[PDB]
Amino acid sequence: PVEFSRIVRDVERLIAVEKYSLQGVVDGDKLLVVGFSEGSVNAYLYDGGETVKLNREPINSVLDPHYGVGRVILVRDVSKGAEQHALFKVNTSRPGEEQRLEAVKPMRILSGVDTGEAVVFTGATEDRVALYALDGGGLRELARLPGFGFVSDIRGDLIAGLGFFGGGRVSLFTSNLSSGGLRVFDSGEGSFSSASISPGMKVTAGLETAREARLVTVDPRDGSVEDLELPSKDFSSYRPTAITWLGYLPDGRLAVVARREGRSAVFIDGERVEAPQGNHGRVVLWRGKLVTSHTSLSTPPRIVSLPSGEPLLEGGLPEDLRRSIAGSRLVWVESFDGSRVPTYVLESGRAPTPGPTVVLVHGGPFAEDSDSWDTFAASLAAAGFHVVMPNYRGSTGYGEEWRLKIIGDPCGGELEDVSAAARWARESGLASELYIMGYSYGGYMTLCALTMKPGLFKAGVAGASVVDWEEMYELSDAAFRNFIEQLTGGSREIMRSRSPINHVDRIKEPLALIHPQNNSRTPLKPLLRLMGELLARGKTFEAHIIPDAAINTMEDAVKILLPAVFFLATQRER
Amino acid sequence: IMPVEFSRIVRDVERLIAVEKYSLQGVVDGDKLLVVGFSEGSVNAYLYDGGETVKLNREPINSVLDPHYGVGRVILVRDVSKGAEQHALFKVNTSRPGEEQRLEAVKPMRILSGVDTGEAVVFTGATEDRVALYALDGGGLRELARLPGFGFVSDIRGDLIAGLGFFGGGRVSLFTSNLSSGGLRVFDSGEGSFSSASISPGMKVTAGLETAREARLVTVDPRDGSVEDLELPSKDFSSYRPTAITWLGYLPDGRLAVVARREGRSAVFIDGERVEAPQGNHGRVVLWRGKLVTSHTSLSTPPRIVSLPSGEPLLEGGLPEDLRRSIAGSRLVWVESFDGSRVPTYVLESGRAPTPGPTVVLVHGGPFAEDSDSWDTFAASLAAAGFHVVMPNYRGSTGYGEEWRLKIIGDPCGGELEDVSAAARWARESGLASELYIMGYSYGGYMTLCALTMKPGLFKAGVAGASVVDWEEMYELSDAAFRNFIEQLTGGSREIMRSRSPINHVDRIKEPLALIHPQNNSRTPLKPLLRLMGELLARGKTFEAHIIPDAGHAINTMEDAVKILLPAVFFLATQRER
Ligand SMILES: [Cl-]
Ligand SMILES: [Cl-]
Ligand code: NA
């Protein structure tokens, strides 16, 4: 019999677990960390195992402080949920005492950095996006940005940042604290991901390309770009495909966090440093040792010491729930056409081998399933399901060629990849029985598996799915028409034939629909129509139509996760 | 503004569904109690003897046919249509628990009732084209007679068959037939309706007759249709002044056992004489090992088997202390409605709510049914979750006389909604309710939708489960029994079918609505509800909807029970924190 309340307790514990990101070193040699729990963010000083809360009421984020600055700048939503913020200053000697920065009117704060004498940030208002500087003399507009943009770093007078300023690529920009202004350096082939300013006032930047990522040196004075060579070749040899973050430490060495194949690595002046498997945040030097944040499919975001991996600050899950979420791994599954599908697997401690396995299909489709904490995967593992997460073609993270392969072929190659994952799970010995579950494009993939690969999965969960492309091409807004057009090669024939609503007759397995009742980007009407067909043709289905369905709170979990875990737990007994 | 306590709610809901519940069906085999029980997460059939039960069935069942005393077998009734209520019958020999034979001579149909004599199975069923009375024996399956609407076999003695029928105007007639020659005979009272029947050693039919505001016992000679009052040797029964008769039957020693009731509590009589029984309601009475055994329930006591007069349980489920305290108390208040009619309304006060506090008007289904001092899993759940529960017997309700029951005929979503609305107002003006919600299943669901369309601003929010949405489309998709029933209820008027369907007044809804519906309900089907969803969306109304797979009206497993009840409680708890 299904242990409904046992599942609800677990989901609640996975939703509440505190998660940490590392922001910097501030005050008297103390770590600045931000903790989130259930959509509630706070900021702390951390030293020697205890933490002191800096803020009063919950915040949205903090700006990045320079090493040793005696204060922290809090960003807070100005109304319950609003998308406009206010800034507050807390002196690190006097935690919990907040001073509103009254010079800065409400606006959308996008990023920020605090040198200790000047707060430099970007912000979006009724009529524009601007880079701003705030100091003891007042607020100044440094520059109008031609789009959303973010401050990456300040050193002396030079400001560096990243902007979405056109071409669908991310550009580098610089400005100055003194005169303002804006120079923009274009990516060309690729897209810039990160930037820090070198002691020599050059901008070091991560350039993401169609293939391998690299570090470049940009001279703001003449716009010249050259490849930067590091003294150690660990970094070059790693062959990174992304560059998460980079920054110069106080002693002048360059710290870089770079990724490949769903996990990241930490380098100092090119030399790799041992780190726990998964993904890392920024790296700081603190009392002579390295510290970074770490997350994985089995570890909620936490602060750790390198190279030991020992956690400094970590949220507490109960012993038994912790045991249920076992290790994660990367396997490369062979799709029907020979292609190798990078697939992450989170094993359940509460399931045998072979055991019940869910193929949890990510959405997007232009997104990546990496080795990072995911509530849904964890909840499935908690509930006694092994979890298989395939980076079907269309995914990001594995080169442009792999992303572009979905184009013109929805419910084709990518479905074969999902299918190959299922089949690998069975053949490798992981799975006794298979389920499929996903949201957004994942939901679409669930409907395509159940109609075009009936008898592969024992049951499916489809959330926030698209059901008929042709209908949506006609209903929706300009940016979404464009997506559908790209995806289907502008073919109405493909639009109809890759729509699952046109194949309801083929479904042989129980289907659970979870769907928002008021979100104009996955509208309800088409889904009512599917339900009408399912009903007319005598299909087994469950449906949950709820208003106001993102997942951060328990309320959100209850609306869109719980029904899927319950349904699946219940089919497991079928 | 606190956060909803989801984990605490599901745990309470789970335990309240999971408590074992029993009902008494007969004495079979070598003096063993047949009981149908919800236990181990489903509805099953058990023999009780020697302080142990033996499970007769394998897969969950829906009910069993009434055995004659001592018969060497049980006939299981099971839905073989994933909830659409096409049932099939399965024989289990009582010496061989766990082994079923399907009675393949009976094609699936809606089984409404049945009696097993040991040599013949007599039952009533509804197909798409009719209700009928059947007999299955050594010679095969026989249609003894067609019935005009819902009909139920009550007893058989020798070849005399006796039963009750809803054959017009919401009245219940008595009917007889003959096991060998078949045929039908219908007996109507111009005074009221027959409520249960048993055949005397004499081959006359003793029945309850519920009149305007009182009930009595009558004898009906099946040879000439003459009716006369039955006097019993003891007058406790006549002095009890029952307003309704729950059940009656002749025991094997010739004595007449009668369970009758008033104001939502029942009392047990043997040959007219009171037998002490625990306060609440009772089911049939049987003779087991020399003594009397009945079932017993109350708003704080889940259905159990007790022996009489001691009232000591033979089988019962236990609730834990925390949950028992979640019910502070219960009482019957009489609410003045729109025409001066006094509406009997049960109130269950939560031990987890203040006064005034959050209150749910929980509208019973039927509509020929009642809120009484009987266990209600939904009411218990709501009290656990911190709502007081108000349970008004609107006109149409059983239990308070034929006049009150029949006033709903021809007037659905009329006077009975005013009664619900008067109960809502009472909850407020009396000081019980800080805020009001409405919730109901089946006809009660219909009432939620009618309150929300016709009486916007009365309730803060509504939960409509297994609800009626459109009488027209429902009628077209109904089998013979339900078509007849709908005709009766709407007074045969298509105008009423239309004007009293919520689907045609969606625009008026101003409050949030939770819809819960089992996909295969074959009484109130999903299709019209999908159309309501479409109308709610087109007109920008807030709602949520939950459609439960492979289930129908009758919930017979823990899982389905959780899926239909839990969204209700979660919804209402979320609404409370607006
Ligand atoms: Cl300036
Ligand atoms: Cl320039
Ligand atoms: Na400048």
| d(CA A485, nearest CA chain B) in Å | 27
Least Cα distance to A63 among A124, A112, A131 occurs for A112
**Cβ contacts of B558 on chain A, cutoff 8 Å:** 1-2
E-strand ranges in B94-168 read 101-102, 110-116, 121-126, 131-137, 140-147, 151-157, 160-168
CB contacts, 8 Å: A573 with chain B: 559
Give residue ranges of B with CB < 8 Å to any A CB.
3-4, 6-7, 10-11, 14, 40-41, 82, 519, 526-527, 530, 533-534, 537, 542-550, 558-559, 562-563, 566, 570, 574
Which among A300, A288, A497 has a CA at the least distance from the CA of A409? Answer: A497
Contact B576, B512 (CB under 8 A): no
- CB–CB contact B530 A535 (8 Å): yes
Q: Which residue of A has its CA nearest to B562?
A: A4
- Would you call A524 and B537 a contact, using CB atoms and an 8 Å cutoff? yes
CB contact under 8 A, A543 and B542: no
Residues contacting residue B35 through CB under 8 Å, at least 6 positions apart:
B22, B23, B24, B25, B45, B46, B47, B48, B53, B305, B315
Total residues belonging to chain B: 578
Q: Is the dihedral of CA B246, B249, B251, B257 positive or negative?
A: positive
Q: Which residues of B touch A528 (CB under 8 A)?
A: 530, 533-534, 537
The CA distance from A356 to B493, in Å, is 54
Asked if A78 and A106 count as a contact pair (C-beta separation under 8 A), the reply is: yes
> Out of 3.30.497.10, 3.40.50.150, 2.130.10.150, 3.40.630.30, which CATH number does the structure's domain B19-318 have?
2.130.10.150
Class of the CATH domain delimited by A17-316: mainly beta
Distance of CA A138 from the midpoint of ligand 3 (Å) = 18
A interface with B, Cβ–Cβ < 8 A, is 1-2, 4-5, 8-9, 12, 510, 512, 517-518, 524-525, 528, 531-532, 535, 540-547, 554-555, 558, 566-567, 570, 573
User: Could you tell me if B366 and B443 are in contact, meaning their C-beta atoms sit under 8 angstroms apart?
Assistant: yes
Which residue does chain A place closest to B521, by CA atoms? A535
Rounded Cα distance, A498 and A468, in Å: 8
Residues B517 and B466 sit within 8 Å (Cβ to Cβ): yes
- What is d(CA B88, CA B123) in angstroms, rounded to the nearest whole number? 12
**Dihedral sign, CA of A393, A397, A399, A400?**
positive
| DSSP-assigned states of every residue in A458-498 | SEEEEES----HHHHHHHS-HHHHHHHHHHTTT-HHHHHHT
Residue B575: helix, strand or coil by DSSP? helix
CA distances (Å), B351 to each of A35, B380, B390, B566, in order? 38, 11, 14, 20
This PDB structure is determined at a resolution in Å of 2.5
Ligand located closest to A181 CA: 3
Nearest to B547 among A1, A542, A566 (CB): A542
CATH architecture for residues B319-578: 3-Layer(aba) Sandwich (3.40)
Q: Which of A168, A173, A157, A249 is nearest to A205 (CA)?
A: A173
Q: How far apart are CA A86 and CA A77, in angstroms?
A: 7
CA distance A527 to A499: 12
DSSP lists the bridge partners of residue B137 as: B140
Q: Where are the domains of chain B?
A: 19-318, 319-578
- Three-state SS annotation for B209-244: EEECCCEEEEEECCCCCCEEECCCCCCHHHHHCCCE
Interval between CA A131 and ligand 1 midpoint (Å): 12
HEC readout, B44-55? EEEEEECCEEEE
Chain A neighbors of B527, CB-CB under 8 A: 532, 535
Q: Residue A4 is nearest to which of B4, B545, B562, comparing CB atoms?
A: B562
Method by which this entry was solved: X-ray
Verify whether the Cβ–Cβ distance B4 to A555 is below 8 Å: yes
Helix axes B558-576, A562-573, angle to 10 degrees: 170
DSSP SS3 for A337: coil
Which residues, 6+ apart, have CB-to-CB distance to B492 below 8 Å?
A: none
**Separation of alpha carbons A204 and A14, rounded Å:** 38
Say how many Å lie between the CA of residue A221 and the centre of ligand 2. Answer: 9
Alpha carbons B417 and B401: distance in angstroms, whole number = 19
Q: Are B270 and B257 in contact (CB under 8 A)?
A: yes
d(CA B220, CA B174): 9
The residues whose Cβ lies within 5 A of ligand 1, an ion, are: A 180
Helix runs in B319-466, H state only? 321-324, 377-385, 402-406, 415-429, 443-454
Nearest Cα of chain B lies from the Cα of A470 at a distance, in angstroms, of 20
Name residues whose C-beta falls within 8 Å of residue B532's C-beta, 6 or more positions apart in sequence.
Answer: B449, B469, B470, B502, B503, B506, B515
Q: Are A101 and A89 a contacting pair, CB within 8 Å?
A: yes
What SS3 class is residue B11? helix
* Contact between residue A287 and residue A67 where contact means Cβ atoms under 8 Å apart: no
Superfamily of domain A317-574: Alpha/Beta hydrolase fold, catalytic domain (3.40.50.1820)
Question: What's the gap in Å between the CA of B548 and the closest CA on chain A?
Answer: 5
